[PDB]
Assembly symmetry: C6
Homo-oligomer: 198 residues x 6
Amino acid sequence: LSATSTTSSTTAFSATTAGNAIAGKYTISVTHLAQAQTLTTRTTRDDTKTAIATSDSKLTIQQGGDKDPITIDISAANSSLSGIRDAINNAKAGVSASIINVGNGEYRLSVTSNDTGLDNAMTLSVSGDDALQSFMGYDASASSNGMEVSVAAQNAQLTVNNVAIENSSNTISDALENITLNLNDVTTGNQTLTITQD
Amino acid sequence: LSATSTTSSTTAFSATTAGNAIAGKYTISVTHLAQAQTLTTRTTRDDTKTAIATSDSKLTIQQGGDKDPITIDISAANSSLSGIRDAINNAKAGVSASIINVGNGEYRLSVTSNDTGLDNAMTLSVSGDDALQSFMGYDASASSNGMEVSVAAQNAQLTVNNVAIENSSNTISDALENITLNLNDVTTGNQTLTITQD
Amino acid sequence: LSATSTTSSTTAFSATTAGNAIAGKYTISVTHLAQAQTLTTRTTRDDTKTAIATSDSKLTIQQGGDKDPITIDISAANSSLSGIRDAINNAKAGVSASIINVGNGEYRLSVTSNDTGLDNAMTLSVSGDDALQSFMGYDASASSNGMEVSVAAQNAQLTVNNVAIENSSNTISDALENITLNLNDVTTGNQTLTITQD
Amino acid sequence: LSATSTTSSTTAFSATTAGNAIAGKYTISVTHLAQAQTLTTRTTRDDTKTAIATSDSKLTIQQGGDKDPITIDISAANSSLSGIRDAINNAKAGVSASIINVGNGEYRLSVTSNDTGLDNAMTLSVSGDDALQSFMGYDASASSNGMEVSVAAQNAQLTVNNVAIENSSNTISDALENITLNLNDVTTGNQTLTITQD
Amino acid sequence: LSATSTTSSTTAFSATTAGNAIAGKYTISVTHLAQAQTLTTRTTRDDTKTAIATSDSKLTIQQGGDKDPITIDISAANSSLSGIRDAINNAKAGVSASIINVGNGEYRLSVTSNDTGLDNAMTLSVSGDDALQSFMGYDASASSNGMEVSVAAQNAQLTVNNVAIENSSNTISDALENITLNLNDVTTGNQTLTITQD
Amino acid sequence: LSATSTTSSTTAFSATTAGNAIAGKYTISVTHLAQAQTLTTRTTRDDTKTAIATSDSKLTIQQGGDKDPITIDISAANSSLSGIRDAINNAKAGVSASIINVGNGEYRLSVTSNDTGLDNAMTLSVSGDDALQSFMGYDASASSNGMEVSVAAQNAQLTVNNVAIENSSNTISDALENITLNLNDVTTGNQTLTITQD
């Protein structure tokens, strides 16, 4: 019922408010932005159309935060870069695949989680085909993997009025009552968010 | 009856005037802003709904400056984080409670005094339940407390024409005759407030 | 009969002209601004209403520059901070009194001369009551005084085309023929005032 | 079907998107711009009209990237600077010739590949005339050549979300799905491209 | 008949042109501005109305550059500061007198030549009265004088396309054909005046 | 037939294009601007009207770059500064004469070539009169001359895409095909001229 406006010392963050947000000055220090994991094949193919697997296979995609594993069927015919990209994207597995032409007639496969957060980090495993498993597999606890981490999963980390706060997201509306905090950048020095009763 | 306008060398302070304010140049140096105390539970709960107390209990909130103590009743059922927040906020005890989700499935309770000032610092004590007392109690003279100080209570401190001035508030209209001083920031070097007869 | 316009290298000074002012470039260096003396009670009262004197008394206010002394009557009843402030202000004694709440439940009395200038420095003496004399007395040649100097009386000091000039005022229209010089700040380096025939 | 807008931290790069481009923040670091090879005659002629060859001859222009060689006929009469420039330009050989008057009554011949890229580097060889071969020949593996490299052929080199990318062009719309990257400059520090769903 | 426009690299100088001025770039370096001599009485009077001379006297004002000497009659009655100022100003002697109130109840007499230039420096001599001669006399070759030089006479000194130029004036339209140069300031480094045919 | 637009990183140069100019980025480094020689008499006259020669004489003006010598007749009567200036200017000899009043009642004669360029440097010789020859003669290979060089003749020197270019002029439309380069200043670091097909 009670409306408020916000002002910020930096482009590093802004904020909007729901009703009944507490007016006043908030000291905000942002030390890390949330990041969505991206895994990229450490090796390349010379095209997007040649099958990589010789058998049909099953891709398992498992995220953290107690989410259900998704198993996708990939026929030998569809074990090409395009085939796998399409099969992942069509699965709606909370991850998204794309192809990168890195030049020199070489292509990489990238898989990115749709949501930022440590809990949105992912495991990828392929059963029923060695070549594809070793091309595309990723397990953080394995020494050799087909994927490398090109973008680390990461949580936002900030302090608000000296209270330490971690969050899966750079859009934070679950931490502070009736405030939504949007993090655009890590901060330096004293930065403040000002909330005034209308 | 006599109107005046104000000008300031810094965004650090501004000022407005009542009638018959004395025209001229005032040298203003601000060394500290007033602050409202915030106490935050040093420990967390994994949710906002589970009762913390096993008995019914009585929360005492005592501010300084010779204000009356307020005692609030908290049933065992209402000794949850939400319960306590609601009970404090509903009491109109000159303090305001909020819940902070610090991430990792953990929640803190914060209590803030509505007014800035050393005299608005607060003591919190709970009788009739050990767990809640040790979760949420705060006494500045005790070695172990449930609260920590996340925002120190603090008085504004400034000098006006070399006269030292302390104030509970950053909105100062009781210090200088017919002037209201608004402090937005601590200053550096020579800063002046200019008052001219209209 | 002959009109002129002025330009200045700095916000430190500006100038306007009467008729027949001599066109050209004036090198101006300002080393000191004029100041109005302010005396402030070195001690405080805990309120503005309690009488300070036990007898009726006579406040003498004597400025320099061969001005007449003004003697004001202050009954014991009116020897409160408010009482004295009112009695001074009502006297039109070329000085002006105000009360400062310095915080911590303490009040100071300030007396300021209305005009800047060394010659507007003041002596304050109270006969017929020790307490008030020692609270509020000021004599520059006495070792102990009730007042301290919080703002030194001071003359403007500048040089115009290498001619040294002293003045009671920062509004100087008696130094240079047909020019009024307004001093806002002390200068650094070569600053010039330009006067051109219209 | 899904539209997106782009924002960039630097004038060093910009970007536009086709439909269904993945929203979000891309960290982009550009270390090299693509360049089109330019070869310039190390010696000069004193005019553009005198034939250089005494026999008719055949200019061969061979680019990399498995492109077909183009052989051009140059009569002795047309072995002048103007003659050769016209014959090259008229051939549409994926290269472009121009004359540079370097002053002092001297002229150079420049040949530039129309497309940037290492693969667009070129070999020039003239059969049937020594003078013209030694004036204008270029082979990267020969110790003495008529041409010098005045602009090295070069590939764009950048990294996008830590993925290394090489490209023949500074207009890159084949590397990243549904994005066109335009490189105007090499970057310094953290620069980012922002893509937001409309 | 042929019009031209001017552009300048600095506010230090500008320029306008008569017809048929030579278009092009002029390198201008200004090392000194012309100055008009000002002489000021080294001593002061405590007022402007008391006669200084006891006899009637004759003030001689002699400038350089082969100008005629002007002799002015000053009665004893008119040997006051106001008297002398009026008598000088009324003489139209190519000099101008003014009174300066330097503060502390003291007044100085200043005499300034109307034109800048070394050749506009002046000698002042009073016959028939010792007091006034010693108050107000000035001769550059005498060891003791009544005047001091508060503003040195000085010539503009500049170089235009490496040609050294001296001038009595900061408004220079007699040095360069069909150009008027206005000097506002001494320069630093390479500064240029650009003249382009319209 | 094909139109193009130009952009430049610096005010140091700009450019416009004729049809069919080659689109793209040109790296331009300017190390020297072209200059027109100016010769100035090392000695002065005290006026512009007194003849310098006692006999009639013949002034020869010879520029470089294989231009024809121009011989001008100067009667003894017309051997004044004004006389010689008029006679030179009226000859249309590709040079232009002016008089400079250097102050102190002294005048110099300046002769400037109308075109910039090393090839527009000049020799001046007077036959039939010693005084005028020694006043005004200039030969770069002679040890004593009447003229000094106050502005060196000089060629523009720049590099375009690493190709070294010399030019008599700062308006260069004969060096690069279908481009006109205007040089306003010597450059520092990487500067580029951008040409884009419309």
